[PDB]
């Protein structure tokens, strides 16, 4: 939960340069099957999303638009104690490259108009 | 010929140089005379816009803006003239309209003058870039 | 129960830290690194320059000259010593870079970026002598650029905006002036954050006179105001207030200050505050002396307050070629800088809200400052504070609530605090009020009081349904943030321990009801009651009060 | 260095590797007309708050070594930079050669 939330918050936000210095996880990243231990991996995945050059490909496993893996570690909720899933999956969802829509989805046009009329009848 | 070579080999005389060279419409030269003093910049920026290189125009308008407070009655006209010819080659029919209108706002204040004053072809310079702007 | 020693840290030396940090700093917004920006600098029209074993050749690397001086003086000085040594050298630098006919000042602002990074870096035991050296040097630097903040009230019919169209030297001097006032800010606040002992040793009437020059230059009443400098200057006024509320016998510094100068400050505060907030054109130009419009001309953070788009940042990078030692900045368009999402406009609505927080906040502060009266003590505070109360009551209710935009929360917390301001007035300062003033405005004060005296119905809630309906009507944006916050950004916004789901419901109840202009705090209504229903003045005898009592019910 | 005038790294700050228009090895981009110098000190300082004494040593050794090799196998490339970098590496290994390990040295 902690690490996930933290780097999620960070991502999009121009302070990439705030991150660059003060914390690379090069050591305990440890994504050689060595090294809870399956959660800093999602921050490594979003750092590869930052790398970004076109090698990434189309969305297959319903995960993000993945990239050449030979790799791709886990699903958007690697660890999902009902809140880590939310934080991660939300953040990773932002990798996709509205108020009016808000309440519409909260209770999940012209057709919408008259369907609204009849359903409110 | 000699007048160039003296300009190289002076700045009041080099002022005369650039003046006469712009007078013979040798823009395709003045672009190359001393691209690599103040009464000269009009002479220069003209040929800069006239010949039509996106890079040369860029460099010239760059030095022009790098000045602190030109403030001068003259250059700003040719300055705008050019500063449209960046948007042209980078395609904004909005930026171009803004800058060309500002060109009007300039020309119609300072260079524009009294009513008649003995001549028309003399003013034809001032008026002819105006015509072409349209 | 001892705890063992822990000296085996590989301690980074404080001097070394300072050095490396300056050496690689990149500023908030640009693309390039401070020292290396510096490494692209030549000071040309001054063919030689030299103050103290600090030679620079004609076409020499300014930047390398920096790093030279830096490193050499490294194995010379300790931390604070390295500060003050830089400060003197860079000060001489800036001073001459200033006093010169044909010199362009490119370096100056960037060195002022230095100024910040530097002086901010460690203000712990820094001495006011050095502080003030820099300080005065920059105030009178400013009077060397006093040719800015008093540019006219508006563009005259003849005054043209045909231009070399450079944002260059504009942004140049804008950074200069701002950054400089921003110095004023930062070093003066390091003063305020110094030990109370090292205080009066710096304050002379020179502070009054120099800052008086700049303030008069700044918060113009006959020119264009200029929001950033407006900021800076007024917080320096706040700095005065700070030294007041901090010096146990602040009477020392007060006696230092001059009555005419308290007036030329508070009066211009009035000039500031009786302006208005209109997010309609906070981003264009309109009726002046009335709108704090932060135009793109000067729209970035400022060397502290991360205000918003900061839309100039990368354009800071674009100032140097970042490839060649140079003297005059690289061109920028005055207009490319800057319909997509006015959510930036509403970030700013929250900020200008924080500004009017400052307005009422300093006025509160001076309120508490003058437990004893004074000459600028005149009651027009009562007038105008109550006046602002009235206007952000009436226009409040007729315009701003219901517009589904979270500005209203702070827009109301404002006057909820002004409540404390007026209630302070009632408790303390009712031994000066002039009959002149009370009957020049019997109108607005009674308006203010009755604004909550008509609110004191205290007859709304009774359920959940109607207020949650109010919420669904208005609180849309506020709930956008409520749900971003509950779904993204909080420890407490998961695992409610079953004693706060009710906290959710009733707190949202109270907040929405407090959103729709009505049923303000029981504390609010009774504290206001202790002012009006107490007959300390003949506002309200029954013979002319029961017509309002019946107009409430009663 | 003994004999010249200018500072070592600062010599470096006037270097550009042209005929090889790009390189990348390990978060170590260099643009075409990039400040090799600021690229050197860039890597240096940036890995500073990353590595430690011996660690920063072997890391820069490998990086600047790869740099040498890059500057090595190229037809039209001038090698100007190369000899300055060799002196740099000597200085490094000469500054603090404590309880290190040979493999880097051998490399």
PDB file of N, CA and C in Angstrom, chain C residues 414-449:
ATOM      1  N   UNK C 414     -13.502  33.218   4.996  1.00  0.00           N
ATOM      2  CA  UNK C 414     -13.073  34.603   5.116  1.00  0.00           C
ATOM      3  C   UNK C 414     -13.924  35.368   6.121  1.00  0.00           C
ATOM      4  N   UNK C 415     -15.204  35.559   5.791  1.00  0.00           N
ATOM      5  CA  UNK C 415     -16.030  36.424   6.616  1.00  0.00           C
ATOM      6  C   UNK C 415     -16.358  35.749   7.930  1.00  0.00           C
ATOM      7  N   UNK C 416     -16.259  34.424   7.983  1.00  0.00           N
ATOM      8  CA  UNK C 416     -16.410  33.746   9.259  1.00  0.00           C
ATOM      9  C   UNK C 416     -15.281  34.144  10.199  1.00  0.00           C
ATOM     10  N   UNK C 417     -14.099  34.398   9.646  1.00  0.00           N
ATOM     11  CA  UNK C 417     -13.017  34.968  10.439  1.00  0.00           C
ATOM     12  C   UNK C 417     -13.226  36.452  10.732  1.00  0.00           C
ATOM     13  N   UNK C 418     -13.716  37.202   9.747  1.00  0.00           N
ATOM     14  CA  UNK C 418     -14.012  38.610  10.000  1.00  0.00           C
ATOM     15  C   UNK C 418     -14.993  38.751  11.146  1.00  0.00           C
ATOM     16  N   UNK C 419     -15.836  37.742  11.334  1.00  0.00           N
ATOM     17  CA  UNK C 419     -16.645  37.656  12.539  1.00  0.00           C
ATOM     18  C   UNK C 419     -15.786  37.786  13.785  1.00  0.00           C
ATOM     19  N   UNK C 420     -14.704  37.010  13.861  1.00  0.00           N
ATOM     20  CA  UNK C 420     -13.801  37.129  14.996  1.00  0.00           C
ATOM     21  C   UNK C 420     -13.210  38.521  15.053  1.00  0.00           C
ATOM     22  N   UNK C 421     -12.957  39.109  13.889  1.00  0.00           N
ATOM     23  CA  UNK C 421     -12.387  40.454  13.851  1.00  0.00           C
ATOM     24  C   UNK C 421     -13.322  41.433  14.544  1.00  0.00           C
ATOM     25  N   UNK C 422     -14.580  41.431  14.119  1.00  0.00           N
ATOM     26  CA  UNK C 422     -15.566  42.348  14.676  1.00  0.00           C
ATOM     27  C   UNK C 422     -15.832  42.018  16.138  1.00  0.00           C
ATOM     28  N   UNK C 423     -15.759  40.740  16.504  1.00  0.00           N
ATOM     29  CA  UNK C 423     -16.067  40.373  17.880  1.00  0.00           C
ATOM     30  C   UNK C 423     -14.918  40.788  18.797  1.00  0.00           C
ATOM     31  N   UNK C 424     -13.693  40.751  18.269  1.00  0.00           N
ATOM     32  CA  UNK C 424     -12.564  41.433  18.884  1.00  0.00           C
ATOM     33  C   UNK C 424     -12.847  42.912  19.072  1.00  0.00           C
ATOM     34  N   UNK C 425     -13.407  43.548  18.048  1.00  0.00           N
ATOM     35  CA  UNK C 425     -13.765  44.954  18.175  1.00  0.00           C
ATOM     36  C   UNK C 425     -14.718  45.165  19.341  1.00  0.00           C
ATOM     37  N   UNK C 426     -15.760  44.331  19.428  1.00  0.00           N
ATOM     38  CA  UNK C 426     -16.765  44.499  20.476  1.00  0.00           C
ATOM     39  C   UNK C 426     -16.150  44.346  21.857  1.00  0.00           C
ATOM     40  N   UNK C 427     -15.335  43.306  22.049  1.00  0.00           N
ATOM     41  CA  UNK C 427     -14.763  43.082  23.375  1.00  0.00           C
ATOM     42  C   UNK C 427     -13.802  44.204  23.756  1.00  0.00           C
ATOM     43  N   UNK C 428     -12.856  44.527  22.875  1.00  0.00           N
ATOM     44  CA  UNK C 428     -11.755  45.396  23.261  1.00  0.00           C
ATOM     45  C   UNK C 428     -12.040  46.865  22.981  1.00  0.00           C
ATOM     46  N   UNK C 429     -12.260  47.205  21.717  1.00  0.00           N
ATOM     47  CA  UNK C 429     -11.977  48.554  21.239  1.00  0.00           C
ATOM     48  C   UNK C 429     -13.200  49.447  21.213  1.00  0.00           C
ATOM     49  N   UNK C 430     -14.127  49.288  22.145  1.00  0.00           N
ATOM     50  CA  UNK C 430     -15.274  50.185  22.167  1.00  0.00           C
ATOM     51  C   UNK C 430     -15.087  51.312  23.165  1.00  0.00           C
ATOM     52  N   UNK C 431     -13.870  51.851  23.235  1.00  0.00           N
ATOM     53  CA  UNK C 431     -13.578  53.033  24.036  1.00  0.00           C
ATOM     54  C   UNK C 431     -13.016  54.174  23.184  1.00  0.00           C
ATOM     55  N   UNK C 432     -13.186  54.102  21.858  1.00  0.00           N
ATOM     56  CA  UNK C 432     -12.714  55.117  20.914  1.00  0.00           C
ATOM     57  C   UNK C 432     -13.783  55.530  19.911  1.00  0.00           C
ATOM     58  N   UNK C 433     -14.716  54.626  19.611  1.00  0.00           N
ATOM     59  CA  UNK C 433     -15.602  54.816  18.470  1.00  0.00           C
ATOM     60  C   UNK C 433     -16.270  56.179  18.520  1.00  0.00           C
ATOM     61  N   UNK C 434     -16.188  56.884  17.404  1.00  0.00           N
ATOM     62  CA  UNK C 434     -16.598  58.270  17.320  1.00  0.00           C
ATOM     63  C   UNK C 434     -18.076  58.296  16.974  1.00  0.00           C
ATOM     64  N   UNK C 435     -18.809  59.236  17.568  1.00  0.00           N
ATOM     65  CA  UNK C 435     -20.178  59.441  17.115  1.00  0.00           C
ATOM     66  C   UNK C 435     -20.194  59.766  15.633  1.00  0.00           C
ATOM     67  N   UNK C 436     -19.235  60.585  15.194  1.00  0.00           N
ATOM     68  CA  UNK C 436     -18.981  60.789  13.777  1.00  0.00           C
ATOM     69  C   UNK C 436     -19.062  59.491  12.994  1.00  0.00           C
ATOM     70  N   UNK C 437     -18.306  58.478  13.415  1.00  0.00           N
ATOM     71  CA  UNK C 437     -18.249  57.244  12.639  1.00  0.00           C
ATOM     72  C   UNK C 437     -19.529  56.427  12.787  1.00  0.00           C
ATOM     73  N   UNK C 438     -20.046  56.307  14.013  1.00  0.00           N
ATOM     74  CA  UNK C 438     -21.221  55.469  14.229  1.00  0.00           C
ATOM     75  C   UNK C 438     -22.413  56.005  13.463  1.00  0.00           C
ATOM     76  N   UNK C 439     -22.512  57.312  13.293  1.00  0.00           N
ATOM     77  CA  UNK C 439     -23.652  57.826  12.560  1.00  0.00           C
ATOM     78  C   UNK C 439     -23.295  58.258  11.146  1.00  0.00           C
ATOM     79  N   UNK C 440     -22.027  58.149  10.747  1.00  0.00           N
ATOM     80  CA  UNK C 440     -21.734  58.114   9.323  1.00  0.00           C
ATOM     81  C   UNK C 440     -22.154  56.780   8.740  1.00  0.00           C
ATOM     82  N   UNK C 441     -21.863  55.686   9.446  1.00  0.00           N
ATOM     83  CA  UNK C 441     -22.476  54.412   9.084  1.00  0.00           C
ATOM     84  C   UNK C 441     -23.134  53.722  10.279  1.00  0.00           C
ATOM     85  N   UNK C 442     -24.354  54.150  10.606  1.00  0.00           N
ATOM     86  CA  UNK C 442     -25.307  53.293  11.292  1.00  0.00           C
ATOM     87  C   UNK C 442     -25.828  52.214  10.362  1.00  0.00           C
ATOM     88  N   UNK C 443     -25.750  52.455   9.060  1.00  0.00           N
ATOM     89  CA  UNK C 443     -26.231  51.540   8.038  1.00  0.00           C
ATOM     90  C   UNK C 443     -25.548  50.172   8.033  1.00  0.00           C
ATOM     91  N   UNK C 444     -24.255  50.151   7.700  1.00  0.00           N
ATOM     92  CA  UNK C 444     -23.590  48.902   7.331  1.00  0.00           C
ATOM     93  C   UNK C 444     -23.319  48.002   8.535  1.00  0.00           C
ATOM     94  N   UNK C 445     -23.005  48.581   9.697  1.00  0.00           N
ATOM     95  CA  UNK C 445     -22.774  47.757  10.882  1.00  0.00           C
ATOM     96  C   UNK C 445     -24.034  47.011  11.276  1.00  0.00           C
ATOM     97  N   UNK C 446     -25.155  47.719  11.326  1.00  0.00           N
ATOM     98  CA  UNK C 446     -26.410  47.057  11.624  1.00  0.00           C
ATOM     99  C   UNK C 446     -26.725  46.032  10.548  1.00  0.00           C
ATOM    100  N   UNK C 447     -26.406  46.345   9.287  1.00  0.00           N
ATOM    101  CA  UNK C 447     -26.557  45.338   8.241  1.00  0.00           C
ATOM    102  C   UNK C 447     -25.792  44.082   8.601  1.00  0.00           C
ATOM    103  N   UNK C 448     -24.531  44.257   8.965  1.00  0.00           N
ATOM    104  CA  UNK C 448     -23.675  43.130   9.286  1.00  0.00           C
ATOM    105  C   UNK C 448     -24.266  42.312  10.414  1.00  0.00           C
ATOM    106  N   UNK C 449     -24.618  42.983  11.503  1.00  0.00           N
ATOM    107  CA  UNK C 449     -25.153  42.287  12.663  1.00  0.00           C
ATOM    108  C   UNK C 449     -26.400  41.511  12.285  1.00  0.00           C
TER     109      UNK C 449
END
